[PDB]
Amino acid sequence: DLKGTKTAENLKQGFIGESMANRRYLYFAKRADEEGYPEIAGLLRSIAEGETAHAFGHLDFIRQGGLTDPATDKPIGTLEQMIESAIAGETYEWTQMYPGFAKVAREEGFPEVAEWFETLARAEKSHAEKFQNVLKQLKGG
Amino acid sequence: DLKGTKTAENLKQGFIGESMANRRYLYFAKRADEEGYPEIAGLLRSIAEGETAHAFGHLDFIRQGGLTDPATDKPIGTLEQMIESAIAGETYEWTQMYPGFAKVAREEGFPEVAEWFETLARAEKSHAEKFQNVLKQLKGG
Ligand SMILES: [Cl-]
Ligand SMILES: [Cl-]
């Protein structure tokens, strides 16, 4: 009964925010590492494990409710569906999103940012190919 | 020169998507684990390390450009700023976001989802307190 509800939206938003929180806190922990704050770094890493649990619990409800992947709007019920979601998102990123970001970065006078986005387009293409090979393995039984 | 540009927006969007990709792929790897696909699971985990590198590189450009944290719109130049960003986001989540999500979940007839959001409000309150104690440690020199 979750499809089309505000609660469906809120689970998706929760997933986005918890995902960012884990990345942010681990990035902050690396700064603590460099500067010599190991107890702060360790606390950041442990809090980040909390954010993993929160993100994964949001995804559990999203699937239990027949809602789609926050990133791709594809189903993620089965493992094969999960890999198809990965392929769809990767294809978008390597063919469309990162090339477009690189072009705009060049247009706006940020060539180093553009080369980073071009690196990421190539990297996401490789990810897409790896996930396509996974799907072939799963569909072959 | 990045402030107010499309490239600033694109770095922020890139960070969001890479953050979700790492969480998604690790969630998918746990399903592969359970079902008995260890080579798929290991590949998912390795691809997820790629997404960490991509997310962190987006954050590097965001900081090098004097842009704010995608999650909180607070600066993240210094370690103290990073902890202040964590406190701001956590305060929002525990006081405002998760309580509101829980109330809406109850209004819409999803009591189990509501109890999950109430658990997360309490958890984020604890995170906020831990980060406040970190900031006190840093400001005390
Ligand atoms: Cl420390
Ligand atoms: Cl396998």
Side-chain angles (χ1 to χ4, degrees):
Chain A
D1 30 356
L2 278 168
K3 186 176 173 42
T5 65
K6 295 295 182 174
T7 295
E9 300 174 342
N10 295 339
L11 283 164
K12 167 183 185 181
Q13 186 57 219
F15 175 71
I16 297 172
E18 298 300 310
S19 294
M20 284 200 290
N22 174 279
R23 269 60 277 287
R24 285 160 59 235
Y25 297 165
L26 295 180
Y27 185 87
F28 301 165
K30 282 180 72 177
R31 180 62 168 273
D33 289 336
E34 167 189 306
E35 290 188 16
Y37 298 102
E39 302 198 80
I40 295 175
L43 175 62
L44 275 158
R45 285 177 173 105
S46 187
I47 293 172
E49 295 296 340
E51 311 305 39
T52 300
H54 294 165
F56 288 178
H58 293 323
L59 288 179
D60 285 342
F61 282 115
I62 285 167
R63 291 171 59 261
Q64 181 186 178
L67 306 177
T68 62
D69 187 332
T72 63
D73 199 26
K74 299 283 272 186
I76 52 165
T78 69
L79 183 58
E80 280 188 20
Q81 288 177 327
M82 292 170 178
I83 303 303
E84 290 169 325
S85 176
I87 292 166
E90 291 289 355
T91 299
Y92 166 69
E93 293 193 6
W94 84 254
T95 70
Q96 183 177 351
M97 192 189 76
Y98 282 124
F101 288 182
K103 179 175 186 207
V104 169
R106 290 192 294 271
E107 286 170 343
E108 288 190 322
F110 302 110
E112 187 178 341
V113 180
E115 290 178 18
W116 169 243
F117 291 144
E118 289 289 16
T119 296
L120 270 50
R122 295 187 278 281
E124 298 300 357
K125 181 180 188 185
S126 177
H127 292 178
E129 293 169 341
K130 297 300 177 178
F131 285 120
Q132 289 175 322
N133 299 338
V134 168
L135 185 66
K136 180 185 179 187
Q137 171 187 341
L138 292 173
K139 286 191 309 183
Chain B
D1 30 356
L2 278 168
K3 186 176 173 42
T5 65
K6 295 295 182 174
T7 295
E9 300 174 342
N10 295 339
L11 283 164
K12 167 183 185 181
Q13 186 57 219
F15 175 71
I16 297 172
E18 298 300 310
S19 294
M20 284 200 290
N22 174 279
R23 269 60 277 287
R24 285 160 59 235
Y25 297 165
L26 295 180
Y27 185 87
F28 301 165
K30 282 180 72 177
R31 180 62 168 273
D33 289 336
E34 167 189 306
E35 290 188 16
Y37 298 102
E39 302 198 80
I40 295 175
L43 175 62
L44 275 158
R45 285 177 173 105
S46 187
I47 293 172
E49 295 296 340
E51 311 305 39
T52 300
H54 294 165
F56 288 178
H58 293 323
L59 288 179
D60 285 342
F61 282 115
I62 285 167
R63 291 171 59 261
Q64 181 186 178
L67 306 177
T68 62
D69 187 332
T72 63
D73 199 26
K74 299 283 272 186
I76 52 165
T78 69
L79 183 58
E80 280 188 20
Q81 288 177 327
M82 292 170 178
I83 303 303
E84 290 169 325
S85 176
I87 292 166
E90 291 289 355
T91 299
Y92 166 69
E93 293 193 6
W94 84 254
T95 70
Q96 183 177 351
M97 192 189 76
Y98 282 124
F101 288 182
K103 179 175 186 207
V104 169
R106 290 192 294 271
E107 286 170 343
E108 288 190 322
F110 302 110
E112 187 178 341
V113 180
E115 290 178 18
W116 169 243
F117 291 144
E118 289 289 16
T119 296
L120 270 50
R122 295 187 278 281
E124 298 300 357
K125 181 180 188 185
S126 177
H127 292 178
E129 293 169 341
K130 297 300 177 178
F131 285 120
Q132 289 175 322
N133 299 338
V134 168
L135 185 66
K136 180 185 179 187
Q137 171 187 341
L138 292 173
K139 286 191 309 183

